[PDB]
């Protein structure tokens, strides 16, 4: 049998973890103010 050890948990975690630590960027189309 194949057992995942320090690979899938790390790859998925970092993936998710990074989502919350990502900077958001808005487009000028929505914000039309000076």
């Amino acid at each position: 049998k194949l057992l995942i050890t320090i690979h899938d948990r790390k790859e998925f975690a970092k993936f998710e973890e990074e989502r919350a630590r990502a900077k958001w960027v808005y487009s000028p189309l929505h914000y039309s103010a000076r």
Binding site: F15, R19, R21, A22, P28, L29
Partner: protein, 101 residues
Amino acid sequence: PLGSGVSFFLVKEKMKGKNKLVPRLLGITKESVMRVDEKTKEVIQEWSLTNIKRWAASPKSFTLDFGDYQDGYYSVQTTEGEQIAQLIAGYIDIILKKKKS
């Protein structure tokens, strides 16, 4: 046929139920973003460039935010977050300069 110069990026999309990532092809144009299936090589779902409200680019994962279109949020593992983010921004600028209100 229309399609001479489409930017394709190799990204990994997580499946529902199984905590794993699968390689998928995503086509990004100057009009809209479409998702192509790596196995069938066909467009599954696509979103307009003007419909995107905001977007977040991480070193290993890209995040997308749609206004009144997608219920949730599209988040997957991207190999080139900076390249994709820059490409999207440029397309929006070109449209605004051509069609200004």
